[PDB]
């Protein structure tokens, strides 16, 4: 279960908006190829410590229903066991047994 994975999910959305919105194209503008003989200044790229938790790299989410770790599926907000459980009682729209 753990409260830490639910606490994380809540913490990321104010901090996505707060750090990240100003920073969106800023990795490309100040650092990558778009900085050809323009920017390339350390003093404008030392600012990417602040978005560190708000990163595309920490949107691993896990379950919204239970907060349960490991084996996640974004398309349900669920995992293997917990999908099957909701599916058994017909709670997921469009979901049927597969035959072909």
């Amino acid at each position: 279960a753990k409260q830490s994975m639910k606490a994380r999910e809540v913490k990321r959305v104010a901090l996505a908006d707060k750090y990240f919105a100003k920073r969106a194209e800023l990795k490309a503008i100040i650092s990558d190829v778009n900085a050809s003989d323009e920017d390339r200044w350390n003093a404008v790229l030392k600012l990417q410590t602040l978005p560190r938790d708000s990163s595309p790299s920490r949107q691993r989410n896990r379950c919204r229903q239970t907060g349960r770790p490991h084996g996640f599926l974004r398309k349900f907000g669920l995992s293997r066991i917990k999908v099957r459980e909701a599916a058994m009682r017909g709670e997921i729209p469009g979901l049927k047994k597969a035959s072909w």
Partner: protein, 70 residues
């Protein structure tokens, strides 16, 4: 002197007055003040950021967002 056994004298007895014209007569730093690594210490010499070829396009000073365009 055991004369015969001695190898040739071609640049040995020759030009006991010679310059630094192609190679030094004494070296600096061979007495090791620092240990020699045979490496050049990068990012002290050379750049923290690479050559910028590929994707050379006039810069846009205003924010853009990959899911944010429709």
């Amino acid at each position: 002197m055991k004369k015969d056994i001695h190898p040739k004298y071609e640049e040995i007895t020759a030009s006991c007055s010679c310059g630094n014209v192609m190679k030094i007569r004494s070296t600096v730093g061979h007495d090791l003040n620092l240990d020699v690594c045979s490496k050049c210490h990068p990012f002290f010499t050379g750049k923290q950021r690479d050559v910028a070829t590929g994707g050379r396009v006039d810069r846009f000073n205003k924010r853009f967002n990959i899911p944010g365009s429709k």
